[PDB]
GROMACS .gro file of C-alpha atoms in nm:
model
   12
    1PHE     CA    1   0.000  -0.010   0.014
    2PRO     CA    2   0.187   0.335  -0.113
    3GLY     CA    3   0.054   0.578   0.152
    4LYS     CA    4  -0.342   0.561   0.152
    5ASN     CA    5  -0.449   0.477  -0.214
    6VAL     CA    6  -0.632   0.211  -0.414
    7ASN     CA    7  -0.633   0.230  -0.803
    8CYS     CA    8  -0.337  -0.024  -0.921
    9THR     CA    9  -0.150  -0.157  -0.606
   10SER     CA   10   0.043  -0.480  -0.505
   11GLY     CA   11   0.276  -0.394  -0.199
   12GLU     CA   12   0.481  -0.082  -0.186
   0.00000   0.00000   0.00000
């Protein structure tokens, strides 16, 4: 999760 975001994510 890069910060707090959900569009295209795996584990960052």
